[PDB]
Amino acid sequence: AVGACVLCNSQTSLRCGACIRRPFLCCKCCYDHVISTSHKLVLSVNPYVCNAPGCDVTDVTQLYLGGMSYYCKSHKPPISFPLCANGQVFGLYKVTDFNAIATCDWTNAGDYILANTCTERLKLFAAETLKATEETFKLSYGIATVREVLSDRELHLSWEVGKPRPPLNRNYVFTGYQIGEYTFEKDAVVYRGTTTYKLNVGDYFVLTSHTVMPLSAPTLVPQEHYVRITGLYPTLNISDEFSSNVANYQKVGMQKYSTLQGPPGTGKSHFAIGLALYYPSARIVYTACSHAAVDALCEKALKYLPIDKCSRIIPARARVECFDKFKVNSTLEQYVFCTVNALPETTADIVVFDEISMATNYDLSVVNARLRAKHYVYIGDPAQLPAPRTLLTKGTLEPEYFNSVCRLMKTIGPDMFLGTCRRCPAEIVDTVSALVYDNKLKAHKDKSAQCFKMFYKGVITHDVSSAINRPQIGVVREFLTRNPAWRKAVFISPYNSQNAVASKILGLPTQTVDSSQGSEYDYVIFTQTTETAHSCNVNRFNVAITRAKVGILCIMSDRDLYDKLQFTSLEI
Ligand SMILES: [Zn+2]
Ligand SMILES: [Zn+2]
Ligand SMILES: [Zn+2]
């Protein structure tokens, strides 16, 4: 019961018993917390509760020290001192932002703004409190039980009465009962078991509620600037392919950490792998939140780096299939590719943390705690999508609040910016450059004259709250009959239910905007589906149209984003 104050470090025996994370608070800080919030339970070796038999006074502001014990006003001896006096709470070794983080329910955007604008120690308290709240919320959902199994990919479910039903998308991962992790897609539902198992009737599924470990490391280590490249030894013979990044690679070696904003198709993986070639003896750990981001770095490394010095770290509790071409779980290979949640405790010359817009402060801290490195390079784009905030329902989370790295990129600017999009036709580049990049993103490709837009509101139906627009899919079907090259297009929309309908009617492969992030396709067909905050989000819109290498068709619901698209308009 002895520790350091989460607000000012001052040693104490006090912890707030009303806070879900029970943070250590020093006398001057514990007082400022109890006296300004509904939190009145204070914990020491023994709690601050009335020692008198049968008394239920637990409020610290109504308690006094009667010798060596604690008593309320009704039970205190004549010679007693109040626990709360002269701006402090009695304890050994004798905040407006801390109060809001400690008492908020994480359903408002302002709660996330505070968690990213507060002091460093309060960023860890906020990240731990938020993650713990997100887990206890998983318990609120009802259990799903198998009523009947139709096929190897379809079943019928029986839900728990009195408890709400979680959304049925790829985002919500269930645990079968331990028959492996399972996902569902919309009376027949589509099941996807991570482990192939003959679904038994009576078996049940629950969302995996995991224990939130405490955070110790900052989201960002303190910044250091050096006069020379430190702890890294550059090649003199550097491949022409990577010459464009030489100044940026030198910047990387002359700072403790560096941020790289890379818009779509500007060379983020190329930059990341080129760093290994520029500092050929450096041990580099490549990390990201998702298996897909880690695998994309592996694919790029497979092409430029010696395969024998690479290793893909995979947790024994395998959830999805991932990269197979490197030796698995060899922590000491020069190049280690691993998701944040699976990181071993190791050191490195450089840590490259990719797809930074998807990281949370919880992830930023975990990386600093598991990896001790000479240099940290954060790669991503605050104009792309953040990690879903399951509890957030009110307000929009702006990019400067996604995490500490995105906050830096949006306030002081990134240390490095990849300014030339090599993927997209110029119509797409020009649109997103003006939309989210302050006209700093340049097109490498010419206009393809295969980027089309159509303003068609159609009809919005809903599968619970996930939206469908059949008339927008009908417009796509008509377009496909006249444009056979587009037969190979990937269908993209902001909604899983829109994608499920489009899959049956069009037969095109399907992706939500969020799942398409990091991927590229020659042709993309996008149906906005609705005019909601979700489907109009500029970061989601940016990701949606930058998936295309050759052509894109956008069937739009929103006049604003439609008018912004620098595409050829189609009639009907
Ligand atoms: Zn303090
Ligand atoms: Zn508290
Ligand atoms: Zn009492």
Side-chain angles (χ1 to χ4, degrees), residues 311-326 328-372:
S311 186
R312 179 63 161 93
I313 312 307
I314 301 167
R317 312 218 100 81
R319 317 175 302 274
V320 301
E321 297 182 338
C322 68
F323 200 78
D324 275 292
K325 323 296 174 170
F326 297 157
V328 172
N329 293 338
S330 182
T331 304
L332 299 153
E333 300 291 8
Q334 186 175 355
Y335 301 118
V336 169
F337 301 75
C338 179
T339 54
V340 174
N341 279 339
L343 285 175
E345 279 214 332
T346 192
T347 66
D349 296 314
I350 310 177
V351 163
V352 171
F353 191 160
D354 200 11
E355 200 176 25
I356 211 59
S357 72
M358 293 294 289
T360 69
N361 284 341
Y362 195 95
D363 307 308
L364 285 190
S365 176
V366 163
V367 165
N368 283 320
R370 308 200 195 169
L371 311 176
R372 216 52 38 87

Short mmCIF file of all heavy atoms in Angstrom, two decimals, residues 311-372, unseen atoms left out:
data_model
loop_
_atom_site.label_atom_id
_atom_site.label_comp_id
_atom_site.label_asym_id
_atom_site.label_seq_id
_atom_site.Cartn_x
_atom_site.Cartn_y
_atom_site.Cartn_z
N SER A 311 12.00 -12.36 -38.38
CA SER A 311 11.14 -13.23 -37.63
C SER A 311 9.77 -12.59 -37.40
O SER A 311 9.68 -11.41 -37.06
CB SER A 311 11.77 -13.64 -36.31
OG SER A 311 10.95 -14.60 -35.68
N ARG A 312 8.71 -13.38 -37.62
CA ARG A 312 7.35 -12.95 -37.36
C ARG A 312 6.95 -13.53 -35.98
O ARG A 312 6.96 -14.75 -35.82
CB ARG A 312 6.40 -13.49 -38.45
CG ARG A 312 4.93 -13.12 -38.26
CD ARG A 312 4.73 -11.61 -38.33
NE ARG A 312 3.35 -11.22 -38.61
CZ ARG A 312 2.45 -10.93 -37.67
NH1 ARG A 312 2.76 -11.03 -36.38
NH2 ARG A 312 1.23 -10.54 -38.02
N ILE A 313 6.63 -12.66 -34.99
CA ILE A 313 6.21 -13.12 -33.66
C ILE A 313 4.70 -13.31 -33.70
O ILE A 313 3.97 -12.41 -34.12
CB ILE A 313 6.63 -12.15 -32.52
CG1 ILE A 313 8.11 -11.73 -32.62
CG2 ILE A 313 6.28 -12.70 -31.13
CD1 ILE A 313 9.10 -12.82 -32.72
N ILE A 314 4.24 -14.50 -33.34
CA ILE A 314 2.83 -14.87 -33.36
C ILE A 314 2.44 -15.41 -31.99
O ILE A 314 3.08 -16.36 -31.51
CB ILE A 314 2.60 -15.96 -34.44
CG1 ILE A 314 3.00 -15.44 -35.83
CG2 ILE A 314 1.15 -16.45 -34.40
CD1 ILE A 314 3.10 -16.49 -36.86
N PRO A 315 1.40 -14.82 -31.36
CA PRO A 315 0.96 -15.33 -30.05
C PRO A 315 0.30 -16.69 -30.19
O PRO A 315 -0.48 -16.90 -31.12
CB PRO A 315 -0.03 -14.27 -29.57
CG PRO A 315 -0.55 -13.65 -30.80
CD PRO A 315 0.56 -13.71 -31.82
N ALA A 316 0.62 -17.61 -29.26
CA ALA A 316 0.09 -18.97 -29.23
C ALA A 316 -1.45 -18.98 -29.34
O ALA A 316 -2.00 -19.84 -30.02
CB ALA A 316 0.56 -19.68 -27.97
N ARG A 317 -2.13 -17.95 -28.80
CA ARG A 317 -3.58 -17.82 -28.95
C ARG A 317 -3.82 -17.12 -30.30
O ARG A 317 -4.11 -15.92 -30.34
CB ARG A 317 -4.21 -17.03 -27.78
CG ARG A 317 -3.74 -17.52 -26.40
CD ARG A 317 -4.81 -17.52 -25.31
NE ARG A 317 -5.38 -18.86 -25.07
CZ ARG A 317 -4.81 -19.80 -24.32
NH1 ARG A 317 -3.64 -19.58 -23.74
NH2 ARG A 317 -5.40 -20.98 -24.17
N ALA A 318 -3.63 -17.87 -31.40
CA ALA A 318 -3.76 -17.40 -32.77
C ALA A 318 -5.22 -17.09 -33.10
O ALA A 318 -6.08 -17.97 -33.03
CB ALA A 318 -3.20 -18.42 -33.74
N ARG A 319 -5.48 -15.83 -33.46
CA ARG A 319 -6.81 -15.29 -33.76
C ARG A 319 -7.08 -15.24 -35.28
O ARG A 319 -8.12 -15.70 -35.74
CB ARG A 319 -7.01 -13.93 -33.05
CG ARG A 319 -6.48 -13.95 -31.59
CD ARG A 319 -6.51 -12.64 -30.82
NE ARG A 319 -5.77 -11.55 -31.47
CZ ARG A 319 -4.47 -11.33 -31.31
NH1 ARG A 319 -3.73 -12.14 -30.56
NH2 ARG A 319 -3.89 -10.30 -31.92
N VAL A 320 -6.13 -14.71 -36.07
CA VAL A 320 -6.25 -14.70 -37.54
C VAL A 320 -4.96 -15.26 -38.18
O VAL A 320 -3.91 -15.30 -37.53
CB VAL A 320 -6.65 -13.33 -38.17
CG1 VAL A 320 -7.99 -12.82 -37.64
CG2 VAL A 320 -5.54 -12.30 -37.99
N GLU A 321 -5.05 -15.71 -39.43
CA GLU A 321 -3.91 -16.22 -40.19
C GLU A 321 -3.01 -15.04 -40.55
O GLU A 321 -3.51 -13.97 -40.93
CB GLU A 321 -4.41 -16.90 -41.49
CG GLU A 321 -5.28 -18.12 -41.27
CD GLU A 321 -5.73 -18.81 -42.55
OE1 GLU A 321 -5.73 -18.16 -43.61
OE2 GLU A 321 -6.09 -20.01 -42.48
N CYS A 322 -1.69 -15.21 -40.39
CA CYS A 322 -0.75 -14.14 -40.72
C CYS A 322 0.52 -14.65 -41.46
O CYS A 322 0.59 -15.83 -41.82
CB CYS A 322 -0.43 -13.31 -39.48
SG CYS A 322 0.53 -14.19 -38.25
N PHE A 323 1.46 -13.74 -41.75
CA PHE A 323 2.69 -13.95 -42.50
C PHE A 323 3.45 -15.22 -42.13
O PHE A 323 3.88 -15.35 -40.98
CB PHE A 323 3.58 -12.72 -42.33
CG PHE A 323 4.61 -12.64 -43.41
CD1 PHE A 323 4.28 -12.19 -44.68
CD2 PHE A 323 5.92 -13.01 -43.17
CE1 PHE A 323 5.24 -12.11 -45.68
CE2 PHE A 323 6.88 -12.92 -44.17
CZ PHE A 323 6.54 -12.47 -45.42
N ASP A 324 3.69 -16.10 -43.15
CA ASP A 324 4.33 -17.43 -43.09
C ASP A 324 5.80 -17.57 -43.55
O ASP A 324 6.47 -18.54 -43.19
CB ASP A 324 3.50 -18.44 -43.91
CG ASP A 324 2.32 -19.10 -43.21
OD1 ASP A 324 2.56 -19.89 -42.27
OD2 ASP A 324 1.17 -18.85 -43.63
N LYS A 325 6.30 -16.63 -44.37
CA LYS A 325 7.64 -16.73 -44.97
C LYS A 325 8.84 -16.46 -44.03
O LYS A 325 9.96 -16.72 -44.47
CB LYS A 325 7.76 -15.85 -46.23
CG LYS A 325 6.51 -15.79 -47.11
CD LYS A 325 6.14 -17.13 -47.72
CE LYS A 325 4.82 -17.06 -48.47
NZ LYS A 325 4.56 -18.29 -49.27
N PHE A 326 8.66 -15.97 -42.79
CA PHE A 326 9.80 -15.76 -41.87
C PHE A 326 9.80 -16.84 -40.79
O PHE A 326 8.75 -17.44 -40.53
CB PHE A 326 9.72 -14.39 -41.17
CG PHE A 326 9.78 -13.17 -42.05
CD1 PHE A 326 9.27 -11.96 -41.61
CD2 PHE A 326 10.41 -13.22 -43.28
CE1 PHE A 326 9.34 -10.84 -42.41
CE2 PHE A 326 10.48 -12.09 -44.08
CZ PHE A 326 9.93 -10.91 -43.64
N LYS A 327 10.95 -17.05 -40.09
CA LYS A 327 10.97 -18.00 -38.97
C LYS A 327 10.05 -17.45 -37.86
O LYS A 327 10.06 -16.24 -37.61
CB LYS A 327 12.40 -18.24 -38.47
N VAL A 328 9.17 -18.29 -37.32
CA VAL A 328 8.20 -17.84 -36.33
C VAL A 328 8.72 -17.89 -34.89
O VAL A 328 9.31 -18.90 -34.47
CB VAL A 328 6.87 -18.62 -36.50
CG1 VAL A 328 5.89 -18.34 -35.36
CG2 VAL A 328 6.24 -18.32 -37.85
N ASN A 329 8.53 -16.78 -34.16
CA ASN A 329 8.80 -16.62 -32.73
C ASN A 329 10.28 -16.70 -32.34
O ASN A 329 10.61 -17.22 -31.28
CB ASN A 329 7.95 -17.60 -31.90
CG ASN A 329 6.47 -17.29 -31.97
OD1 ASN A 329 6.09 -16.16 -32.26
ND2 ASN A 329 5.60 -18.26 -31.70
N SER A 330 11.15 -16.14 -33.16
CA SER A 330 12.57 -16.08 -32.87
C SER A 330 12.86 -14.63 -32.51
O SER A 330 13.23 -13.85 -33.37
CB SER A 330 13.38 -16.51 -34.08
OG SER A 330 14.77 -16.50 -33.76
N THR A 331 12.63 -14.29 -31.24
CA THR A 331 12.77 -12.95 -30.66
C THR A 331 14.13 -12.25 -30.92
O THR A 331 14.21 -11.02 -30.94
CB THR A 331 12.47 -13.07 -29.15
OG1 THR A 331 11.18 -13.65 -28.96
CG2 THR A 331 12.59 -11.74 -28.40
N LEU A 332 15.19 -13.03 -31.15
CA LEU A 332 16.53 -12.47 -31.32
C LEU A 332 17.00 -12.26 -32.78
O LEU A 332 18.19 -11.95 -32.99
CB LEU A 332 17.55 -13.30 -30.55
CG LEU A 332 17.30 -13.33 -29.05
CD1 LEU A 332 17.84 -14.59 -28.43
CD2 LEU A 332 17.76 -12.03 -28.39
N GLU A 333 16.10 -12.39 -33.79
CA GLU A 333 16.49 -12.10 -35.18
C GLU A 333 16.67 -10.58 -35.31
O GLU A 333 16.00 -9.82 -34.60
CB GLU A 333 15.46 -12.62 -36.20
CG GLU A 333 15.24 -14.12 -36.15
CD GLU A 333 16.35 -15.04 -36.62
OE1 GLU A 333 17.48 -14.55 -36.88
OE2 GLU A 333 16.10 -16.26 -36.71
N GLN A 334 17.58 -10.13 -36.18
CA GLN A 334 17.83 -8.70 -36.36
C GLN A 334 16.56 -7.88 -36.67
O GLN A 334 16.43 -6.73 -36.23
CB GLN A 334 18.85 -8.51 -37.47
CG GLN A 334 19.28 -7.06 -37.65
CD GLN A 334 20.38 -6.90 -38.67
OE1 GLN A 334 20.93 -7.86 -39.20
NE2 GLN A 334 20.75 -5.67 -38.96
N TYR A 335 15.61 -8.49 -37.39
CA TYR A 335 14.35 -7.88 -37.78
C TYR A 335 13.20 -8.65 -37.18
O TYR A 335 12.99 -9.82 -37.51
CB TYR A 335 14.21 -7.84 -39.31
CG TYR A 335 15.34 -7.06 -39.93
CD1 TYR A 335 16.24 -7.67 -40.80
CD2 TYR A 335 15.59 -5.75 -39.55
CE1 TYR A 335 17.32 -6.97 -41.32
CE2 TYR A 335 16.67 -5.04 -40.06
CZ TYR A 335 17.53 -5.65 -40.96
OH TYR A 335 18.58 -4.92 -41.47
N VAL A 336 12.47 -8.01 -36.28
CA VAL A 336 11.34 -8.63 -35.61
C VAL A 336 10.04 -7.93 -35.98
O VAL A 336 9.94 -6.72 -35.87
CB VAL A 336 11.59 -8.64 -34.09
CG1 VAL A 336 10.33 -9.04 -33.33
CG2 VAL A 336 12.74 -9.58 -33.77
N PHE A 337 9.05 -8.68 -36.44
CA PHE A 337 7.78 -8.12 -36.89
C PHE A 337 6.73 -8.71 -35.95
O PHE A 337 6.62 -9.92 -35.85
CB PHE A 337 7.51 -8.51 -38.35
CG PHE A 337 8.58 -8.03 -39.32
CD1 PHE A 337 9.81 -8.66 -39.40
CD2 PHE A 337 8.33 -6.96 -40.17
CE1 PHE A 337 10.79 -8.21 -40.28
CE2 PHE A 337 9.31 -6.51 -41.05
CZ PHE A 337 10.54 -7.13 -41.09
N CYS A 338 6.03 -7.84 -35.22
CA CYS A 338 5.13 -8.30 -34.17
C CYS A 338 4.06 -7.26 -33.83
O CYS A 338 4.37 -6.07 -33.77
CB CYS A 338 5.98 -8.62 -32.94
SG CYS A 338 5.03 -9.20 -31.51
N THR A 339 2.80 -7.71 -33.58
CA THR A 339 1.76 -6.79 -33.17
C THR A 339 2.07 -6.24 -31.75
O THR A 339 2.79 -6.89 -30.98
CB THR A 339 0.37 -7.46 -33.20
OG1 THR A 339 0.42 -8.65 -32.42
CG2 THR A 339 -0.08 -7.79 -34.58
N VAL A 340 1.55 -5.05 -31.39
CA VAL A 340 1.78 -4.46 -30.07
C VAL A 340 1.43 -5.44 -28.92
O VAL A 340 2.25 -5.63 -28.03
CB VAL A 340 1.06 -3.10 -29.90
CG1 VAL A 340 1.19 -2.57 -28.45
CG2 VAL A 340 1.57 -2.08 -30.89
N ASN A 341 0.25 -6.09 -28.98
CA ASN A 341 -0.24 -7.00 -27.93
C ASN A 341 0.57 -8.24 -27.71
O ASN A 341 0.40 -8.88 -26.67
CB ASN A 341 -1.72 -7.39 -28.16
CG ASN A 341 -2.69 -6.34 -27.68
OD1 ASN A 341 -2.36 -5.48 -26.84
ND2 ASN A 341 -3.91 -6.38 -28.22
N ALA A 342 1.46 -8.60 -28.66
CA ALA A 342 2.32 -9.80 -28.60
C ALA A 342 3.81 -9.48 -28.38
O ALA A 342 4.62 -10.40 -28.33
CB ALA A 342 2.15 -10.62 -29.88
N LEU A 343 4.17 -8.20 -28.26
CA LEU A 343 5.56 -7.80 -28.13
C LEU A 343 6.26 -8.45 -26.96
O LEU A 343 5.76 -8.43 -25.84
CB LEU A 343 5.68 -6.27 -27.97
CG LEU A 343 5.47 -5.42 -29.21
CD1 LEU A 343 5.51 -3.89 -28.83
CD2 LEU A 343 6.50 -5.75 -30.29
N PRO A 344 7.43 -9.02 -27.21
CA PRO A 344 8.22 -9.53 -26.08
C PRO A 344 8.97 -8.37 -25.40
O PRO A 344 9.01 -7.23 -25.89
CB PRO A 344 9.19 -10.51 -26.75
CG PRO A 344 9.41 -9.93 -28.11
CD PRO A 344 8.18 -9.11 -28.48
N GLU A 345 9.57 -8.66 -24.23
CA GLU A 345 10.37 -7.67 -23.53
C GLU A 345 11.74 -7.75 -24.13
O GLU A 345 12.45 -8.74 -23.93
CB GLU A 345 10.43 -7.99 -22.03
CG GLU A 345 9.20 -7.52 -21.30
CD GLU A 345 9.47 -7.05 -19.89
OE1 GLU A 345 10.44 -7.57 -19.28
OE2 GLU A 345 8.73 -6.18 -19.38
N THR A 346 12.11 -6.75 -24.94
CA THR A 346 13.39 -6.75 -25.64
C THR A 346 13.92 -5.31 -25.86
O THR A 346 13.31 -4.32 -25.46
CB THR A 346 13.25 -7.58 -26.95
OG1 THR A 346 14.55 -7.82 -27.51
CG2 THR A 346 12.37 -6.90 -27.97
N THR A 347 15.11 -5.21 -26.44
CA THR A 347 15.72 -3.95 -26.79
C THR A 347 15.88 -3.90 -28.32
O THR A 347 15.71 -4.91 -29.01
CB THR A 347 17.07 -3.81 -26.05
OG1 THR A 347 17.97 -4.80 -26.54
CG2 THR A 347 16.92 -3.92 -24.52
N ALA A 348 16.18 -2.71 -28.86
CA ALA A 348 16.36 -2.52 -30.30
C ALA A 348 17.13 -1.23 -30.56
O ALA A 348 17.17 -0.33 -29.71
CB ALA A 348 14.98 -2.45 -31.01
N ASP A 349 17.76 -1.13 -31.72
CA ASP A 349 18.41 0.12 -32.12
C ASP A 349 17.31 1.08 -32.63
O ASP A 349 17.35 2.28 -32.34
CB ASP A 349 19.53 -0.13 -33.16
CG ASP A 349 20.68 -0.97 -32.60
OD1 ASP A 349 21.14 -0.67 -31.45
OD2 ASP A 349 21.15 -1.88 -33.30
N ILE A 350 16.31 0.54 -33.35
CA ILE A 350 15.18 1.31 -33.85
C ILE A 350 13.92 0.48 -33.64
O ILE A 350 13.90 -0.74 -33.85
CB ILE A 350 15.33 1.69 -35.37
CG1 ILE A 350 16.70 2.32 -35.69
CG2 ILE A 350 14.16 2.60 -35.84
CD1 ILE A 350 16.97 2.65 -37.16
N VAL A 351 12.87 1.15 -33.21
CA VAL A 351 11.55 0.56 -33.13
C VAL A 351 10.76 1.36 -34.18
O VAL A 351 10.78 2.59 -34.15
CB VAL A 351 10.88 0.66 -31.73
CG1 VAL A 351 9.37 0.41 -31.83
CG2 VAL A 351 11.49 -0.33 -30.75
N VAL A 352 10.11 0.66 -35.12
CA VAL A 352 9.26 1.33 -36.11
C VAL A 352 7.82 0.97 -35.75
O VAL A 352 7.48 -0.21 -35.77
CB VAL A 352 9.61 0.90 -37.56
CG1 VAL A 352 8.58 1.45 -38.54
CG2 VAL A 352 11.03 1.32 -37.96
N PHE A 353 6.99 1.96 -35.37
CA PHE A 353 5.59 1.70 -35.00
C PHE A 353 4.74 2.28 -36.14
O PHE A 353 4.62 3.48 -36.28
CB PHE A 353 5.24 2.37 -33.65
CG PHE A 353 3.92 2.00 -32.98
CD1 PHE A 353 3.72 2.22 -31.63
CD2 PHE A 353 2.88 1.43 -33.71
CE1 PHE A 353 2.50 1.93 -31.03
CE2 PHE A 353 1.67 1.14 -33.10
CZ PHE A 353 1.49 1.38 -31.76
N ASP A 354 4.17 1.39 -36.95
CA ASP A 354 3.39 1.74 -38.14
C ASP A 354 1.89 1.84 -37.87
O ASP A 354 1.40 1.37 -36.84
CB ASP A 354 3.67 0.69 -39.22
CG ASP A 354 3.37 1.09 -40.67
OD1 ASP A 354 3.11 2.30 -40.92
OD2 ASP A 354 3.41 0.21 -41.55
N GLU A 355 1.14 2.45 -38.84
CA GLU A 355 -0.30 2.69 -38.81
C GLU A 355 -0.69 3.37 -37.49
O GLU A 355 -1.59 2.91 -36.75
CB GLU A 355 -1.11 1.41 -39.09
CG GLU A 355 -2.53 1.72 -39.54
CD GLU A 355 -3.41 0.54 -39.94
OE1 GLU A 355 -3.17 -0.59 -39.46
OE2 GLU A 355 -4.31 0.75 -40.78
N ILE A 356 0.05 4.46 -37.18
CA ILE A 356 -0.05 5.17 -35.92
C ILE A 356 -1.44 5.76 -35.69
O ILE A 356 -1.80 5.84 -34.54
CB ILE A 356 1.09 6.21 -35.71
CG1 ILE A 356 1.40 6.35 -34.22
CG2 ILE A 356 0.79 7.55 -36.36
CD1 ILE A 356 1.84 5.02 -33.56
N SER A 357 -2.23 6.08 -36.72
CA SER A 357 -3.58 6.59 -36.47
C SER A 357 -4.47 5.54 -35.73
O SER A 357 -5.38 5.92 -35.03
CB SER A 357 -4.25 7.08 -37.76
OG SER A 357 -4.60 5.97 -38.56
N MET A 358 -4.17 4.23 -35.88
CA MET A 358 -4.92 3.15 -35.25
C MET A 358 -4.50 2.85 -33.81
O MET A 358 -5.16 2.05 -33.14
CB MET A 358 -4.82 1.86 -36.07
CG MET A 358 -5.50 1.94 -37.40
SD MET A 358 -7.32 2.12 -37.31
CE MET A 358 -7.78 0.50 -36.74
N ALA A 359 -3.38 3.40 -33.35
CA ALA A 359 -2.92 3.17 -31.99
C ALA A 359 -3.71 4.03 -31.02
O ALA A 359 -4.27 5.08 -31.38
CB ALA A 359 -1.43 3.49 -31.88
N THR A 360 -3.80 3.55 -29.78
CA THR A 360 -4.37 4.29 -28.65
C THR A 360 -3.18 4.65 -27.75
O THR A 360 -2.07 4.14 -27.96
CB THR A 360 -5.43 3.43 -27.90
OG1 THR A 360 -4.79 2.34 -27.23
CG2 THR A 360 -6.50 2.90 -28.82
N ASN A 361 -3.40 5.51 -26.75
CA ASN A 361 -2.35 5.80 -25.78
C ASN A 361 -1.97 4.56 -24.97
O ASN A 361 -0.78 4.41 -24.64
CB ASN A 361 -2.71 6.97 -24.91
CG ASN A 361 -2.53 8.27 -25.64
OD1 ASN A 361 -1.85 8.38 -26.67
ND2 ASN A 361 -3.16 9.30 -25.12
N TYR A 362 -2.91 3.61 -24.81
CA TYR A 362 -2.66 2.35 -24.14
C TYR A 362 -1.55 1.58 -24.90
O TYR A 362 -0.53 1.21 -24.30
CB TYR A 362 -3.95 1.53 -23.97
CG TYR A 362 -3.74 0.42 -22.96
CD1 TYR A 362 -4.09 0.59 -21.62
CD2 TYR A 362 -3.10 -0.76 -23.32
CE1 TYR A 362 -3.83 -0.40 -20.67
CE2 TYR A 362 -2.82 -1.75 -22.38
CZ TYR A 362 -3.18 -1.57 -21.05
OH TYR A 362 -2.93 -2.56 -20.11
N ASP A 363 -1.69 1.47 -26.25
CA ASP A 363 -0.69 0.85 -27.13
C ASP A 363 0.64 1.60 -27.11
O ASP A 363 1.69 0.96 -27.02
CB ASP A 363 -1.19 0.78 -28.59
CG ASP A 363 -2.54 0.12 -28.72
OD1 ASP A 363 -2.71 -1.01 -28.20
OD2 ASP A 363 -3.44 0.72 -29.35
N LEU A 364 0.61 2.96 -27.17
CA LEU A 364 1.81 3.78 -27.15
C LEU A 364 2.65 3.49 -25.89
O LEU A 364 3.86 3.28 -25.97
CB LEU A 364 1.45 5.27 -27.21
CG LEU A 364 1.00 5.84 -28.56
CD1 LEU A 364 0.91 7.35 -28.51
CD2 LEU A 364 1.98 5.49 -29.68
N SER A 365 1.96 3.38 -24.74
CA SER A 365 2.59 3.07 -23.47
C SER A 365 3.15 1.64 -23.43
O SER A 365 4.30 1.46 -22.99
CB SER A 365 1.60 3.31 -22.33
OG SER A 365 2.14 2.94 -21.07
N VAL A 366 2.38 0.63 -23.91
CA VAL A 366 2.80 -0.78 -23.95
C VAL A 366 4.08 -0.92 -24.75
O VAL A 366 5.02 -1.58 -24.28
CB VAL A 366 1.70 -1.76 -24.45
CG1 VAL A 366 2.27 -3.13 -24.87
CG2 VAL A 366 0.60 -1.92 -23.39
N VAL A 367 4.18 -0.25 -25.90
CA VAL A 367 5.38 -0.28 -26.71
C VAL A 367 6.58 0.26 -25.92
O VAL A 367 7.60 -0.42 -25.84
CB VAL A 367 5.18 0.44 -28.07
CG1 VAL A 367 6.53 0.72 -28.75
CG2 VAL A 367 4.25 -0.37 -28.98
N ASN A 368 6.45 1.45 -25.29
CA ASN A 368 7.55 2.00 -24.50
C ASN A 368 7.96 1.09 -23.32
O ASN A 368 9.14 1.04 -22.98
CB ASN A 368 7.24 3.41 -24.05
CG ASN A 368 7.43 4.37 -25.16
OD1 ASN A 368 8.38 4.26 -25.94
ND2 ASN A 368 6.55 5.33 -25.29
N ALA A 369 7.00 0.33 -22.77
CA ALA A 369 7.25 -0.59 -21.66
C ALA A 369 7.91 -1.90 -22.07
O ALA A 369 8.65 -2.49 -21.27
CB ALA A 369 5.96 -0.87 -20.93
N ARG A 370 7.62 -2.41 -23.28
CA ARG A 370 8.20 -3.69 -23.71
C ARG A 370 9.48 -3.55 -24.55
O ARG A 370 10.28 -4.48 -24.61
CB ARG A 370 7.15 -4.57 -24.44
CG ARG A 370 5.89 -4.73 -23.61
CD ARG A 370 5.07 -5.91 -24.03
NE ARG A 370 3.71 -5.84 -23.48
CZ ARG A 370 2.70 -6.62 -23.85
NH1 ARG A 370 2.89 -7.56 -24.77
NH2 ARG A 370 1.50 -6.48 -23.29
N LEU A 371 9.66 -2.38 -25.19
CA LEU A 371 10.80 -2.13 -26.06
C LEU A 371 11.69 -0.95 -25.60
O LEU A 371 11.25 0.20 -25.60
CB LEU A 371 10.34 -1.89 -27.52
CG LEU A 371 9.34 -2.92 -28.10
CD1 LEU A 371 8.87 -2.54 -29.51
CD2 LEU A 371 9.92 -4.30 -28.10
N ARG A 372 12.95 -1.24 -25.25
CA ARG A 372 13.90 -0.18 -24.90
C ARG A 372 14.77 0.03 -26.12
O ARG A 372 15.56 -0.85 -26.47
CB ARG A 372 14.75 -0.56 -23.68
CG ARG A 372 15.07 0.64 -22.76
CD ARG A 372 13.85 1.46 -22.30
NE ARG A 372 12.66 0.65 -22.01
CZ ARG A 372 12.40 0.08 -20.84
NH1 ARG A 372 13.23 0.25 -19.82
NH2 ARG A 372 11.30 -0.64 -20.67
#
